Ligand binder design. Structure first.
Ligand SMILES: CCCCCCCCCCCCCCCCCC(=O)OC[C@H](COP(=O)([O-])OCC(O)COP(=O)([O-])OC[C@@H](COC(=O)CCCCCCCCCCCCCCCCC)OC(=O)CCCCCCCCCCCCCCCCC)OC(=O)CCCCCCCCCCCCCCCCC
Ligand SMILES: CCCCCCCCCCCCCCCCCC(=O)OC[C@H](COP(=O)([O-])OCC(O)COP(=O)([O-])OC[C@@H](COC(=O)CCCCCCCCCCCCCCCCC)OC(=O)CCCCCCCCCCCCCCCCC)OC(=O)CCCCCCCCCCCCCCCCC
Ligand code: HEA
Ligand SMILES: CCCCCCCCCCCCCCCC(=O)O[C@H](COC(=O)CCCCCCC[C@@H](C)CCCCCCCCC)COP(=O)(O)O[C@H]1[C@H](O)[C@H](O)[C@H](O)[C@@H](O)[C@@H]1O
Ligand SMILES: CCCCCCCCCCCCCCCC(=O)O[C@H](COC(=O)CCCCCCC[C@@H](C)CCCCCCCCC)COP(=O)(O)O[C@H]1[C@H](O)[C@H](O)[C@H](O)[C@@H](O)[C@@H]1O
Ligand SMILES: CCCCCCCC/C=C\CCCCCCCC(=O)OC[C@H](COP(=O)(O)OCCN)OC(=O)CCCCCCCCCCCCCCC
Ligand code: HEC
Ligand code: HEM
Ligand code: HEM
Ligand SMILES: CCCCCCCCCCCCCCCC(=O)OC[C@H](C)OC(=O)CCCCCCCC[C@@H](C)CCCCCCCC
Ligand SMILES: CCc1nc2ccc(Cl)cn2c1C(=O)NCc1ccc(N2CCC(c3ccc(OC(F)(F)F)cc3)CC2)cc1
Lengths: 51, 203, 50, 50, 223, 535, 55, 139, 92
């Protein structure tokens, strides 16, 4: 009736679980997250230009 | 590892079942070809706006189009398109060898078209017209040379796909790859037919 | 809450391949119909009134 | 749309990377001594000629 | 000539008055004074296309000429009349002498080049990097007259080799060496630029190493 | 009767000598068949070519600074004073048939020698081939590499040239003079006087054609003897253990493929010597202390030295009436560099504590710290090498020379750190990819589950399958894992007729089931040997 | 192919317009690809022999 | 495949109409007749839509109603073998880097860099295209 | 189907008990997998110090000094964040 859940979900995950994914990931969700992160990097680059 | 988890004949299969569902790779290549059409539309716009601005003699005096070699190359390109369609006909069947033969002769005809275009290019260059020489020369060379780059890409695709058919048992996925390559080649020679009807016929 | 689009019909961190359980898509907003079956009929009834 | 992935997912990965590096090379105009593109965003013709 | 000066003035009044005052005195922090620069300076600077500079940066780059030969001569004559200075060499006909500027001696021209030109350009006339955003461009494109006028007037961060440092004979000799190096085929296969160690090492690590490693992968196994 | 003649000669040899036991012992020696293990061979092969070319060059080269007027064929250098060494280099290039080709392939072989040594060093470092059994090998190999570099420097320095002359002036003269206590004394001993000393080029000739090649040959003999008797290490695999060598015996297979690889490496070097121009000295006038060029780089294996010169911020110290020039720094640098390269396995065993006899190599991913360290070292080497080319990089790629210098200055501290972090995380990620494929199996196309719309990648277990769908995870054993069904027996039976036409179906069958049987028997034999090792 | 390339190396080395030709002189083009031809033929010869051995 | 076809025939019809009206109203009522830049662009975007819509209509006539094209379709109707969807691959990043090398060699006029980038692009595209077909090493 | 499971007996030698664990690094036993965090932080501080000291040299310009300051400050901030998180137990 009661589930054995962690008190708080994993914050970061294990070391080195992402770099090779980024290099190779074919999952669309991760690619979209990359798009968003890189696009805000650029949205800061521009915008700093504006300032 | 009793026998297999995925009971599939090959590690690579058609991205969607082409019998009752569209050949998804075919749809993708058709979309991309439709976009490359608009790229060539940009090139045609450049050429046409240049044409409108000439003083009534659109090919300058130093330039004299070599139709004698220009017609044969277009004939060779349409023949290569026909042989590519024959290669497709072989591809729908399990006859990888017929596909390879047809695509090899199509590759040879496309290479001959490229060689003839290069010969005509050097003939025009030696007789004055060049990209840094004239507006007509520049637009003509730009349009025909981007078409030639497309042709070279098609030859690259032909050789790559023949090699791919050599390294795996001929699959329906390989047939779809051959079909999309044929679609690209048909786009290439259709664009050439337009470029010939404009550059050499309409003038 | 009260989402639509079939995107909220999968584990909020979506599984690889986006789904383990796909609702019977009946309208533009399948997730709302799944989570709120009682509104299904309502959705079909009040729709035309505008 | 209830799909497991995109149609050509290696292709969309290629699209993302082509973007990232194309944007990087375009922005790399700044490291050059002359600087980045001085002509307006629209980059009208004669101002963009060599 | 009167009409030549008129045309030069017309072209000047609408292409460069912004950088250089209408009286040819340089506008402060925009362009230098053209008084005394000479027809040679104008010819070299405008024939190479540098002068419609269109920006103030570390190094004004070469670009397609914005004026034709006659207009180049008109501008140069205008500047020559205003201040008076070096004049572009010309042959019997009157055109800018280019064939006549190829000095007969090349070994002496080679020594002159290596002592003076190679310092920044190259062993064989290629380009070279300079202090901060500057560089010495490749000499392959410059025609004999352009090389001569470049020596005769140091454009920017170029030492100005007056007619006394390099007499017309030495200037023609250097022009001959420059043209010979620029147009001489690289004996011993495709000459990777002119810089030896860098293109050579890059070509090793690409061609030879990729080939050797690929052949090793073909011969060898993976495990 | 060639068979009878061969038998008679074998009997004569075995009657006078008794090498039957020894000959059989080497002809049966097993060598692992991994492509990476051929990397070292390249260097050896290149080395041989150098020798074969070098002797040729010695028949036409006169080392001397005796000033002479060219008076030769090459017009652009006529009546120009040059050292006899430069004149003979020009004569080889122009006067002797094939001399340009021979010296060109010699220089290309020198570059390939250096590059292949670097690649081999990287291979053995990342694979951990330097551990307990084979530190000495590493050490001598390090020395060997060092020698090669210096000989390369003495090679293009032999033809007295403007580029090579200014390289001598910078490196030898300036740095040796900079050394505090004996620097000037070492400079005067090496040159027999000041820099333009008339006994430099002959001394470099002696060092380069006789001394250093001899030392390199002796060290290569030691290297190959150790590898031969410390039987080559191997990668982990099915039937591979720390106490065996799985591969191909020397005589039938290994010898043939090694000879063919030497032939193909010689072919690559000849093609480069023809089609690519290396060190066009004729464009480079004879060395004069005043004449200069903008490029002024050494061969790529000393570009790291030159870049370290460029990027080190002009730091000098001035003791009581004495100067310690900034050049001194690079010497110390080299020391540390070499002092760290030659000694690395001992630092590794002191830090890690691995004092065990290691015969199975380690995949670089399985050693994240050492892989990160090696990536950091390669990053620093590349940064220094490109810093040496910052002049040309700025010229071609429009970047201000000061900007490139400061990019290198900040990089030689920052880029190593970033590369270490990235390489560490990358190695761990490769480990996790291996674990994922072990615990799930290879990935394939997607399928939609029947009742509901679940999407599953349809994995492929690599081992026993549990009662339910998911398999029993396998245990990592240090061997590569198949991430693609591509590389398994899936969709890999093309028509064996030809490229154009088929063969009869009976022939295709015979061939394909024969190959299937052969590969299954190979797998079965390896598995049976594996089981027999323990069980 | 390796053998034909070696024969071509012999033929080109024996009979080819090598020797420095001053810039501009007719026959300079033949010289400019003399050493390239030597290297091309030699490399193709030995490379093809090695390829045949590997195969 | 009928709805996404009709979409493209509607777009094709509008683009053909727009190109025709632009050509008619520029050939006269304009300083230099047909603009020849907007006109050709409109004509060939009409062609773009025409090609896509023609292919879609061909396939739709070739294809019986799919579950995705069928209203009142149960999820179990579409359940079954979906096609191959490429798993992880690092070749796309290499293709991107190759094209970036070629692009910088084009911007910075470095013909050697253009050639190197083209070679890299061919190699990386070969790797991607052959990634899931390279048979096992035979030794 | 053409593949067989592999097993390797590797001589194990410290006793791989202090430092890294297989959960963090899946191949901890297979080779050097732990670099102490102390050497991390010391090296980062040394990198920042080197960046600062290069401000002293022969360069009239000051864009260079400002870039050095920025990079060294970034390194110091990264090292400080890592040290603070480690001290507190990877919190915040
Ligand atoms: C300038 C003019 C040059 C024009 C040259 C372009 C020619 C390409 C058309 C050929 C037909 C084709 O692509 O059919 C796809 C066809 C089907 O894909 P598949 O992998 O076979 O099918 C399995 C799955 O679809 C595989 O699943 P997936 O998820 O990977 O899908 C990817 C796959 C399948 O995806 C598709 O088919 C979707 C549609 C997009 C493909 C078309 C774009 C490719 C070219 C774009 C470059 C712009 C120009 O497409 C690709 O292979 C992408 C190619 C990467 C190119 C990136 C360039 C940067 O691919 C092939 O089999 C052959 C492709 C070979 C292309 C050769 C390109 C080299 C050109 C350089 C020559 C140098 C001259 C110029 C200098
Ligand atoms: C120079 C560069 C070019 C390349 C040269 C290096 C190649 C190295 C490959 C090694 C192969 C080798 O040594 O083969 C010899 C090798 C001798 O070793 P083995 O017979 O196995 O003896 C048992 C072990 O030595 C028993 O030793 P173990 O394995 O139990 O451990 C002891 C081992 C410990 O391992 C080591 O420490 C070896 C490293 C030694 C360091 C320095 C060695 C070389 C340095 C000098 C530099 C050379 C320049 O020490 C050695 O075995 C060293 C043997 C010395 C030979 C070194 C080869 C060089 O094989 C032969 O005896 C084959 C020759 C058969 C006789 C000729 C057949 C016909 C006879 C007719 C003659 C005239 C006909 C006229 C009509
Ligand atoms: C999506 C497009 C977009 C966006 C979001 C903006 C956002 C802004 N733009 Fe925009 N702007 C354009 C597109 C855009 N602009 C275009 C297309 C032009 C015409 C260009 C041309 O003429 O060629 C233009 C022109 C333009 C001009 C005219 C310049 C000129 O031509 O003379 C100005 C002047 O103030 C301006 C201001 C701003 C400001 C103040 C914002 C703000 O909304 C920006 C918000 C700022 C930030 C988000 C920065 C804050 C972040 C940081 C401080 C962190 C930085 C850290 C790092 C980089 C590590 N813009
Ligand atoms: C196994 C090795 C195979 C090697 C192939 C061998 C090819 C043989 C080529 C033909 C015979 C030899 C040609 C010798 C004649 C010759 O040298 O060839 C020049 C060209 O040179 C260039 O420009 C470059 C043009 C681009 C095409 C060639 C690129 C080939 C590269 C890619 C191969 C090496 C590998 C490098 C990879 C690096 C990539 C790193 C990722 C051509 O003249 P030009 O173009 O005008 O040179 C200018 C003078 O004019 C002018 O003054 C002068 O001042 C200059 O401006 C000069 O450029
Ligand atoms: C493998 C190599 C990887 C790179 C590794 C290193 C990464 C660390 C990057 C450190 C960046 C440091 C940038 C600062 C540099 C600096 O301090 O210099 C400035 C110029 O700033 C700049 O450009 C900013 C440049 C920033 C770009 C760094 C980008 C990273 C690139 C290089 C990555 C691509 C690598 C691809 C490798 C290919 C594969 C390799 C196998 C001003 O010079 P200057 O020009 O003289 O300006 C005068 C004033 O001084 C004076 O006041 C004023 O009055 C004026 O007169 C003015 O002239
Ligand atoms: C982007 C490329 C760059 C920008 C876009 C260019 C597009 C052009 C495409 C095709 C045209 C190729 C046909 C070339 C042959 C036609 C004849 C001709 O062009 O005229 C002779 C002139 C001399 O004329 P001259 O001085 O007056 O002396 C007369 C002697 N008596 O040669 C030339 O400069 C022509 C050299 C052009 C080489 C272009 C290489 C394209 C490959 C780029 C690879 C992809 C890069 C990816 C970038 C994202
Ligand atoms: C670094 C000092 C310096 C030396 C010394 C020098 N140059 Fe230059 N050279 C330059 C610079 C900087 C330019 C760029 C001119 C400009 O931007 O207007 C240049 C431009 C040129 C050009 C123009 C080529 C073109 O395409 O624009 C030629 C020709 C030339 N130099 C030849 C020579 C010759 C001949 C000598 C020997 C008399 C020489 N240079 C000595 C730095 C130098
Ligand atoms: C002239 C330079 C060199 C030559 C001719 C050479 C040659 C070889 C060859 C042929 C091998 C065996 C094949 C292989 O494992 O790849 C080998 C192994 C080895 N080399 Fe070198 N190498 C050279 C440089 C170096 C350097 C720079 C190092 C450091 C080094 C250290 C080693 C070690 C430790 C081994 C043993 C690897 C093993 O046992 O598998 N060598 N060398
Ligand atoms: C063992 C490793 C060796 C290396 C790395 C090496 C490297 C080099 C290099 C790069 C050059 C420049 C050639 C040029 O630019 O024209 C050179 C020149 C020369 N080498 Fe070596 N070499 C080696 C061995 C030898 C040997 C064994 C000999 C003699 C048997 C030799 C004899 C010569 C001679 C005579 C020259 C000058 C001739 C000329 O430059 O044309 N070399 N060397
Ligand atoms: C190559 C090896 C480099 C070894 C240098 C041995 C230096 C001994 C002589 C120093 C001296 O007294 O000359 C006067 C000096 C120029 O002015 C000053 O007194 C203020 C100096 C402020 C900065 C000092 C930093 C020193 C760091 C080095 C100790 C580290 C070396 C590693
Ligand atoms: C300088 C950089 C450079 N700039 C250019 C410009 C143009 C060109 Cl073309 C080439 N370059 C280069 C160049 O090629 N550099 C290679 C080089 C550098 C240093 C040494 N060093 C040997 C040891 C000496 C030494 C050190 C310690 C000693 O003490 C001991 F060992 F205990 F006895 C004794 C001697 C210092 C010189 C060799 C090659």
């Amino acid at each position: 009736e009661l589930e054995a859940r962690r008190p708080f979900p994993e914050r970061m995950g294990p070391k080195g679980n992402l770099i090779y994914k980024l290099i190779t990931t074919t999952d669309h969700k991760l690619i979209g997250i990359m798009y968003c992160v890189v696009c805000f990097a650029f949205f800061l680059v521009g915008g700093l230009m504006a300032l | 590892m009793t026998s297999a988890v995925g009971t599939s004949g090959t590690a690579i299969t058609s991205r969607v079942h082409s019998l009752n569902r569209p050949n998804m790779v075919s749809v993708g290549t058709i979309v991309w070809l439709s976009s490359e059409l608009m790229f060539f539309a940009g090139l045609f716009a450049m050429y046409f706006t240049a044409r409108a601005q000439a003083g009534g003699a659109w090919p300058p005096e130093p330039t004299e189009l070599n139709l004698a070699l220009a017609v044969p190359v277009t004939l060779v390109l349409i023949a290569s398109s026909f042989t590519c369609q024959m290669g497709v006909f072989a591809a729908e069947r399990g006859d990888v060898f017929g596909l390879r033969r047809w695509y090899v002769i199509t590759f040879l005809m496309g290479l001959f078209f490229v060689l003839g275009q290069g010969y005509e290019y050097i003939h025009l260059v030696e007789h004055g017209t060049t990209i840094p020489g004239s507006a007509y020369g520049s637009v003509f060379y730009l349009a025909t040379g981007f078409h030639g780059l497309h042709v070279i890409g098609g030859l690259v695709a032909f050789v790559l796909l023949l090699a791919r058919t050599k390294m795996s048992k001929f699959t329906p996925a390989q047939a779809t790859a051959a079909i999309v390559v044929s679609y690209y080649w048909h786009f290439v020679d259709i664009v050439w037919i337009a470029l010939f009807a404009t550059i050499y016929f309409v003038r | 809450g009260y989402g639509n689009s079939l995107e909220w019909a999968t584990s909020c961190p979506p599984p690889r391949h986006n789904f383990t359980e796909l609702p019977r898509i009946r309208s533009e907003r399948p997730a709302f119909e799944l989570h709120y079956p009682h509104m299904v009929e309502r959705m079909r009834a009040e729709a035309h009134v505008g | 749309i209830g799909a497991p992935d995109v149609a050509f997912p290696r292709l969309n990965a290629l699209s993302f990377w082509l973007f990232l590096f194309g944007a990087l090379i375009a922005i790399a105009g700044f490291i050059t001594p002359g600087g980045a593109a001085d002509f307006g965003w629209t980059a009208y013709s004669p101002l963009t000629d060599a | 000539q009167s009409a030549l000066l008129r045309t030069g003035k017309q072209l000047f009044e609408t292409s460069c008055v912004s950088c250089h005052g209408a009286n040819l005195q340089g506008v402060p922090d925009r362009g230098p004074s053209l008084i005394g620069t000479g027809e040679a300076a104008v010819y070299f600077q405008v024939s190479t296309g540098r002068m419609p500079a269109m920006r103030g940066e570390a190094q004004a780059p070469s670009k397609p000429p914005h004026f034709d030969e006659s207009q180049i001569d008109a501008l140069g004559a205008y500047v020559q009349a205003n201040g008076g200075g070096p004049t572009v060499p010309r042959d019997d006909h009157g055109a800018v002498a280019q064939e006549s500027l190829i000095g007969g001696d090349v070994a002496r021209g080679g020594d002159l080049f290596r002592l003076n030109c190679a310092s920044c350009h190259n062993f064989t006339g290629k380009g070279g990097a300079l202090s901060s955003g500057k560089y010495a461009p490749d000499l392959g494109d410059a025609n004999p007259a352009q090389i001569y006028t470049a020596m005769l007037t140091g454009p920017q961060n170029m030492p100005k080799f007056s007619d006394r440092q390099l007499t017309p004979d030495e200037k023609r000799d250097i022009v001959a060496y420059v043209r010979e190096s620029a147009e001489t085929p690289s004996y011993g296969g495709y000459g990777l630029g002119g810089f030896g160690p860098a293109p050579e090492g890059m070509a090793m690590w690409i061609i030879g190493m990729v080939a050797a490693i690929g052949v090793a992968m073909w011969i060898g196994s993976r495990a | 009767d060639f068979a009878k003649l061969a038998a008679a000669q074998g009997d004569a040899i075995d009657s006078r000598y008794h090498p039957s036991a020894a000959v059989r012992r080497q002809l049966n020696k097993v060598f692992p068949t991994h492509w990476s293990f051929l990397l070292g061979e390249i260097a050896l092969y290149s080395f041989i070519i150098l020798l074969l070319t070098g002797v040729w060059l010695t028949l036409f080269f006169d080392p001397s600074m005796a000033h002479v007027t060219y008076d030769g064929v090459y017009q652009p250098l006529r009546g120009v004073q040059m050292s006899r060494a430069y004149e003979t280099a020009l004569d080889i290039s122009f006067e002797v048939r094939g001399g340009l080709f021979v010296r060109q392939v010699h220089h290309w072989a020198a570059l390939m020698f250096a590059a292949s040594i670097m690649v081999h060093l990287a291979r053995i470092f990342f694979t951990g081939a330097f551990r307990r059994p084979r530190e000495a090998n590493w050490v001598i190999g390090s020395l060997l590499l060092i020698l090669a570099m210096f000989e390369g420097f003495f090679g293009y320095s032999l033809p007295d040239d403007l580029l090579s002359g200014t390289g001598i002036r910078a490196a030898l003269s300036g740095i040796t003079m900079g050394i505090p206590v004996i620097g000037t004394w070492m400079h005067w001993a090496l040159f027999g006087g000041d820099f333009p000393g008339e006994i430099l080029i002959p001394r470099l000739y002696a060092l380069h054609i006789l001394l250093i090649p001899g030392i390199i040959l002796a060290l290569i003999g030691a290297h190959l003897a150790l590898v031969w008797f410390q039987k080559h290490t191997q990668f982990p695999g099915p039937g591979r253990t720390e106490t065996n060598v799985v591969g191909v015996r020397v005589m039938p297979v290994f010898a043939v493929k090694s000879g063919a690889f030497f032939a193909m490496i010689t072919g690559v070097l000849g093609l480069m010597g023809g089609l690519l121009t290396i060190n066009p000295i004729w464009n480079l006038g004879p060395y004069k202390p005043s004449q200069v060029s903008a490029g002024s780089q050494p061969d790529f294996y000393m570009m790291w030295t030159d870049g370290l010169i460029r990027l080190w911020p002009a730091w000098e110290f001035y003791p009581f009436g004495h100067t310690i020039p900034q050049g001194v720094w690079v010497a110390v640098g080299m020391g540390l560099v070499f002092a760290l390269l030659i000694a690395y396995p001992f630092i590794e065993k002191k830090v890690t504590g691995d004092d065990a006899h290691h015969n199975l190599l380690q995949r670089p991913r399985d050693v994240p710290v050492r892989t990160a360290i090696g990536s950091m070292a390669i990053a620093l080497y590349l940064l220094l090498t490109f810093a040496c080319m910052n002049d040309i990089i700025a010229l071609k790629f429009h970047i201000s020379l000061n900007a490139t210098t400061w990019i290198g200055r900040i990089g030689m501290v920052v880029l190593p750190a970033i590369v270490y972090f990235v390489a560490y995380r990358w190695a761990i990620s490769l480990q996790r990819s291996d674990r994922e494929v072990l615990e799930h199996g290879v990935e394939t196309g997607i399928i939609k589950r029947l009742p509901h719309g679940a999407y599953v990648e349809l994995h492929q277990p690599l081992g026993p399958v549990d009662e339910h769908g998911h398999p029993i995870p396998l245990e990592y054993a240090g061997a590569p894992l198949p991430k693609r069904m591509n590389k398994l027996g899936s969709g890999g039976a093309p028509g064996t007729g030809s490229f154009l036409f088929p063969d009869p179906a009976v022939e295709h069958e015979a061939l394909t089931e024969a190959a299937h049987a052969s590969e299954h028997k190979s797998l079965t034999a390896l598995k049976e040997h594996q089981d027999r090792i323990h069980g | 192919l390796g053998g034909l390339s070696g024969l071509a190396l012999l033929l080109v080395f024996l009979f080819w317009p090598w020797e420095y030709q001053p810039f501009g002189s007719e026959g300079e083009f033949l010289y400019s690809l003399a050493t390239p031809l030597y290297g091309l033929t030699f490399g193709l010869s030995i490379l093809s022999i090695g390829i045949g051995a590997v195969l | 495949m009928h709805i996404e076809a009709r979409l493209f025939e509607i777009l094709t019809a509008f683009f053909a109409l727009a190109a025709v009206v632009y050509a008619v109203l520029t050939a006269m009522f304009a300083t230099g007749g047909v603009e020849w830049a907007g006109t050709t662009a409109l004509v060939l975007t009409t062609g773009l839509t025409l090609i896509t819509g023609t292919f879609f209509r061909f396939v739709a006539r070739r294809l019986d109603t799919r579950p995705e094209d069928y209203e009142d379709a149960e999820i179990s109707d579409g359940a079954g073998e979906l096609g191959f969807f490429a798993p992880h691959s690092w070749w796309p990043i290499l293709i991107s880097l190759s094209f970036s090398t070629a692009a910088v060699g084009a911007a910075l006029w470095l013909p050697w860099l253009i050639a190197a980038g083209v070679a890299f692009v061919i190699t990386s595209v070969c790797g991607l295209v052959f990634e899931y077909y390279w048979g096992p090493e035979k030794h | 189907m053409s593949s067989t499971q592999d097993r390797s007996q590797l001589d194990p030698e410290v006793e791989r008990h202090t430092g890294v664990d297989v959960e963090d690094v899946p191949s901890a036993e297979w080779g050097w997998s732990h670099m102490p965090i102390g050497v991390m932080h010391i090296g980062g501080l040394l990198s920042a110090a080197f960046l600062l000291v290069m401000m002293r040299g022969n360069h009239v310009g000051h864009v260079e000094d400002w870039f050095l300051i920025g990079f060294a400050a970034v390194i110091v901030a990264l090292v400080g964040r890592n040290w603070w998180l480690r001290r507190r137990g990877w919190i915040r």
